[PDB]
Amino acid sequence: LMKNPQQDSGLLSNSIDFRDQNLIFSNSGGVCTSSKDKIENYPAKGYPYKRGVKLSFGDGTTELEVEAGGGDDLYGVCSDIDEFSGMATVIPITNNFTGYLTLKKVNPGDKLNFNQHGELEKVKSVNAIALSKAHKLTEDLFIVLASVFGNR
Amino acid sequence: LMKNPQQDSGLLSNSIDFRDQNLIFSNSGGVCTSSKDKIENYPAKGYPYKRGVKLSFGDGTTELEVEAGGGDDLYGVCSDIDEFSGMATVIPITNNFTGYLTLKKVNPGDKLNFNQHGELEKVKSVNAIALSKAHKLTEDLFIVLASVFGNRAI
Amino acid sequence: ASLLDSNFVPINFTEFVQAISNTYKQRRIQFYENLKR
Amino acid sequence: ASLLDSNFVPINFTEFVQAISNTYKQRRIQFYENLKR
Amino acid sequence: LFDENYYAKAVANIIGEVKDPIMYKWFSPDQIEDVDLQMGYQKTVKWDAFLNANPTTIANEVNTISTIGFSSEVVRLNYLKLQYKFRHLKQTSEKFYTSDSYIGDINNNLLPFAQAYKLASSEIIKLINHFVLTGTVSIQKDGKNQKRLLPNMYGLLNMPEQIKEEVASGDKDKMDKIFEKIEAGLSKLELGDEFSTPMMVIVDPATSLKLVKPYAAASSCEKWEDVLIQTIKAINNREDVYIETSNLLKHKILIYPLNSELIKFKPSKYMLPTPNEQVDKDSTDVAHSYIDFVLGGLLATRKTILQVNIKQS
Amino acid sequence: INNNLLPFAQAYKLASSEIIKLINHFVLTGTVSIQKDGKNQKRLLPNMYGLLNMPEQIKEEVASGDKDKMDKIFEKIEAGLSKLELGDEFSTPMMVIVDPATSLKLVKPYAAASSCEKWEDVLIQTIKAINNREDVYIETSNLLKHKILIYPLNSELIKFKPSKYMLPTPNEQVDKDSTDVAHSYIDFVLGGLLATRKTILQVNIKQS
Amino acid sequence: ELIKFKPSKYMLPTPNEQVDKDSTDVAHSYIDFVLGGLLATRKTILQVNIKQS
Amino acid sequence: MPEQIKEEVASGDKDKMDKIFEKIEAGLSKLELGDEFSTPMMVIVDPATSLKL
Amino acid sequence: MKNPQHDASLLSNSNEFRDKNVEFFASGGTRTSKFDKLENHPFLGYPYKRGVKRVIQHYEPHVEAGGGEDLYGICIDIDEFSKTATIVPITNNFEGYLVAKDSTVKVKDKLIFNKDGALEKVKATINATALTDAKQISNEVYLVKVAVFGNK
């Protein structure tokens, strides 16, 4: 549940190969990015990293936040998190995105949709297309290369 | 089937008038272009020039390509092609576009949609509005000025 | 080298053809000089 | 012009790129000079 | 320029640490020639003659005589421009990100421009070496999801019209079977009148391990590597034979001559990574930079490369 | 380029090179053909033979199952060398011509394998056993195919008397017309190999 | 500037070197010429056709 | 030469010089010489038109 | 078209002299006489190495691929710039490689030109004899060596 946990080790690790080196949870942002992409930041409730987000409102005392969600509430996609400030970098749904996102625990061409917890699942509204197959990072953590290009 | 006229011209063009000199197939891009527009390129499959495109996948040996198409598979519009490298310039459907596009073989204000061959036709899923009447370039080729702004509801 | 110059002695048929072409060009120039519109 | 000689002063990015290319070629030549199969 | 462009100054002060490409070892100094071109093509014209029929016997009267035909071939080499983008810390903001013994944010993986450029250039050079060896561009170990390149863009391992031998899956452990396939391919090679040249062999680590076993009771003096060197010397007229091991290869052996007349590598002078002038700057501390590089330019003659693939099924 | 037309000098050079290759093939094998299969052969005159088809010589045939056994190959070679009859001209250098595959087989260590000696050295010693310890030369030709040819380099036994016009020579006639295309002709003469009987050893390793 | 004629320098008739000869009194000769090379700008030539129907 | 001014005189008016010259005026108006207008002009006619002129 | 070797990816090897002439660029005939009549005609289409017919329509008549009772000659060479085809009239015999319909053509077979100008196994209209088996060069291109010596 951390983008880049910090732990010391007694040994260096040799990077033997330069291929399939980017399939890690700490790889933030998009695989292919434009300089004209619109990027926002919101206070984060929970850990919406690599997940679709929705706007959540309090009792008015504090400002609105973003939490993991989908369906009809999908506001954007969280692509980075600064843990010191609790800030979530959000790409709005009106802007297309290409990158690795959390997948529900799927092959290229299958059309995906966001669920209640902000995870991708095989099929309504979101335009999500799988560009690869599922990759298992943790026993419960699966990622997939997806293309988000708006709503139908 | 080519961005630039295949046949070499038999005369020297007369550069006198400034009006009605842009209704040509070699007019790449858009009539009104913003410096903040997001532009991508893709390996071209076929000749999707001035047509709506979709993402095409194969066995997986090579990367995905873009080919002329529309309907529920619409991903963007192709506004330029580099023939040497086979590169198609794509403007994502999430970015609004205004320019000349191929029309199926129509008056201003008519609502249009993209067909299976990436051609605009009079109407459902895509917001496209014609800003002029069809201009005939070839006996089988017509272009129309259109504004495409996202995907509509229902 | 033109056929107008009598001192011109061609060596081969290539030189002869070149001389014929030069003769045609010189005749055209002379015609435009003589012509009085 | 090469980056190996610190006396080189690039005026613009074009000369900078040309200097980079020359430096790469010079290092290739030096590698083959120091190569012993 | 260096009084105005910190990024250019940093590139000039950091370019030295980037190591040399390892593909230089696979070629001779006379086999590499630069071409001044970023994207485009180069052409070469070669003429050839052939006999259309048996010769004609001249006896008595005859005017229908067999003919000798001629042909021209144009070989085209394509060169393609490619680019990568990377993020880094801004120079003015580096002071707030310095630490006790390092500069950069470990939590967010943000780096100074010089270090980011050096690492990115190293990765790009690895990709270039992989292309030059195998002729494909991919970032997957499976080798799928490849980039679609232009035609007439090949590597040493996928060059068409060359000798290709396959060791069966059940014989992958038998070095004698592997050597049988290698010998068949060496016999089928056609070097012509340029045969007297040093030869180059590239092998995988497993094959390198198999080469040190004694030649087959087993011989007590000579190894399979020595036998291979003698066999290749037989066809290259006792010239030098160089052996290299590459972790890029997997159960494949490449044998080819180091002669410029048969195989020539004409890379672009801008092939190796070069910084781009454009820098993305916002009101935050993150900036972006671009690296350009050019791929293409391998030319070879027909039937001059032996490619042995050992099936692992 | 679009019509495959060359100037006369370049066309002549290329045609002469091809014809010289054909002449070399005839001299080595005694047949004329432009096919790799060796079929559709031009019919030649009698008393026109090459080194490989010269009649009344020694012929040895290695069986298909033993194609890889260099020991069986050498057994046949020794039998043929015993059957050679050089008479009083035996003290002469000898010449061996092999195909590339056999040339590759000849560099293996002699067979357990023996150090310091190869099959090539064994063959040279065996031939020196019959040519009065004279010189032995080995050549590789891709024109041969699973063949080994051994013969003496002595003019008293084998003599090549070619015509003085054997190599390509231009003809005087040149076809001309109103266009830019002309035609030329090249002449060459084949024949003239003389050999004494039972002085050539031909070993054929059968594959099928 | 508007209309220019760039003929080949071999446009006008030129004899050919080849002459057909026979055993009779008749021989044959050849003449070569080259066609093409007119260049004009658009809308600079007026062509009036009087229909004689 | 394509992309040039073409005018047609009707069959019933083939003997009316006023109609022919009206078509000539229309074509002359539609001509586009640009800034190269200060140049001599050439008119080529057939014998019948020369007779009518 | 006519010369498919101008898009070569690598240099060819010119050491061998056998099996080097069965190509689509081998224009002309295998054996040619100085007294062979050659006629040049305008063409429409791709009549290279095929039987041709005259088409009369206003322009002069042109030649195009054809055969049967309409056979006029055989096209042996083309100039692409001038779009002109060199034709040997059917009254003159010919020996050379010509386009065949399929790969079922064998030696000694009697052949006929079809409507596309391709040679197919068989009364007949012309005398044409196959001297070799059909040889594949492209996936749909077969050439066969044929002696055409008049009409039946």
Coordinates of N, CA and C in Angstrom, one line a residue, chain B residues 42-45 59-65 82 84-87, chain E residues 39-41 76 78-80 140 143-148 150-151:
Chain B
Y42 N 1.3 7.4 -34.8 CA 1.1 6.0 -34.8 C 1.5 5.3 -36.1
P43 N 1.9 4.1 -36.0 CA 2.2 3.3 -37.3 C 0.8 3.2 -38.1
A44 N 0.9 3.6 -39.3 CA -0.3 3.7 -40.1 C -0.6 2.3 -40.8
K45 N -1.8 1.9 -40.8 CA -2.3 0.7 -41.4 C -3.3 1.1 -42.5
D59 N -1.4 -10.3 -33.6 CA -1.0 -11.4 -32.7 C -0.3 -11.0 -31.4
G60 N 0.3 -9.8 -31.5 CA 1.1 -9.3 -30.4 C 2.6 -9.2 -30.7
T61 N 3.1 -9.8 -31.8 CA 4.5 -9.7 -32.2 C 4.9 -8.2 -32.3
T62 N 4.1 -7.4 -33.0 CA 4.4 -6.0 -33.2 C 3.4 -5.1 -32.4
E63 N 3.7 -3.9 -32.3 CA 2.8 -2.9 -31.5 C 1.5 -2.7 -32.3
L64 N 0.6 -2.1 -31.6 CA -0.7 -1.8 -32.2 C -0.6 -0.7 -33.2
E65 N -1.5 -0.7 -34.1 CA -1.6 0.3 -35.2 C -2.9 1.0 -35.2
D82 N 3.1 11.1 -42.7 CA 4.4 11.0 -43.3 C 4.5 9.6 -44.0
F84 N 7.1 8.4 -45.9 CA 8.4 7.7 -45.8 C 8.4 6.7 -44.6
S85 N 8.0 7.2 -43.5 CA 8.1 6.4 -42.3 C 6.7 5.7 -42.0
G86 N 5.7 5.9 -42.8 CA 4.4 5.3 -42.5 C 3.8 5.8 -41.2
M87 N 3.9 7.1 -40.9 CA 3.5 7.6 -39.6 C 2.2 8.4 -39.8
Chain E
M39 N 17.3 11.1 -41.0 CA 16.2 10.2 -41.5 C 16.2 10.2 -43.0
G40 N 16.1 9.1 -43.6 CA 16.1 9.0 -45.0 C 16.6 7.7 -45.5
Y41 N 17.3 7.7 -46.7 CA 17.8 6.5 -47.3 C 19.0 6.8 -48.1
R76 N 18.9 -0.4 -50.9 CA 18.5 0.8 -50.2 C 18.7 0.6 -48.7
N78 N 17.8 2.3 -45.0 CA 16.9 3.3 -44.4 C 17.5 3.7 -43.0
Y79 N 17.3 5.0 -42.7 CA 17.7 5.5 -41.4 C 16.6 6.3 -40.7
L80 N 16.3 6.0 -39.5 CA 15.1 6.4 -38.8 C 15.5 7.1 -37.5
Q140 N 10.6 -6.0 -24.0 CA 10.1 -7.2 -23.4 C 11.1 -8.3 -23.5
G143 N 10.1 -10.6 -26.2 CA 10.4 -10.2 -27.6 C 9.2 -9.8 -28.4
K144 N 8.0 -9.8 -27.8 CA 6.8 -9.4 -28.4 C 6.6 -7.9 -28.3
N145 N 5.5 -7.4 -28.9 CA 5.2 -6.0 -28.8 C 6.3 -5.1 -29.4
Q146 N 6.8 -5.6 -30.5 CA 8.0 -5.0 -31.2 C 7.5 -3.7 -31.9
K147 N 8.5 -2.8 -32.0 CA 8.3 -1.5 -32.8 C 8.3 -1.9 -34.3
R148 N 7.4 -1.3 -35.0 CA 7.4 -1.5 -36.5 C 8.4 -0.6 -37.1
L150 N 11.1 0.4 -40.5 CA 11.0 0.5 -41.9 C 11.7 -0.7 -42.6
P151 N 11.3 -1.0 -43.8 CA 12.0 -2.1 -44.5 C 13.4 -1.8 -44.8

